[PDB]
A and B are shown apart, each in its own frame.
Chain A
Amino acid sequence: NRFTVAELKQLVARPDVVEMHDVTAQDPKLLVHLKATRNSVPVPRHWCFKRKYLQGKRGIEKPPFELPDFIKRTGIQEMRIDYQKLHDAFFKWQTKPKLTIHGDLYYEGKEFEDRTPWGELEPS
């Protein structure tokens, strides 16, 4: 008694959101509506993959973890004492990394894939 994909595609405001498995839901019309909502996050793509998550990430040599530049410039990477510089690294030099926006999930291939502001702090 299910819709065809063809049928469901015409019954909804956003056909592009419809996938092949959607018509097999308990409520496909609710499911597609929910997928269309502002700021909702997709289900992780690998739910239907036979291999377990991240398990195909094999057979590739990767370099060791790249330290952030403020820690790197502390020189401890070469040491393996200067506690003032060690403080300044975290409390002066610490710069925020390239943080990802809401909803942009990770997966195996992702890695290799007057203008003045109000209420700003005064300079020290």
Chain B
Amino acid sequence: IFCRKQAGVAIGRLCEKCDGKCVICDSYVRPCTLVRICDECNYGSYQGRCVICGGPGVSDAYYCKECTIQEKDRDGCPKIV
């Protein structure tokens, strides 16, 4: 289940285990569009946590080229909750 609220200026992050992965489709191939998340997902204790699984977040999350081509980057906040 994706949050799907209005994406903000906050940037999505990935933990070490979930890195390279597109948030929407788990592909390791061609990261393309930088992930944006809703404020509530960035708020307080949630600052810098992983979009896929809530881990410490070390890298910037991306939608892959296919998700970008399909405009799946536009659906809203993709933090899995």
Direct contact of A and B (CB under 8 A): no
Residues of B near any A CB (own CB < 8 A):
none
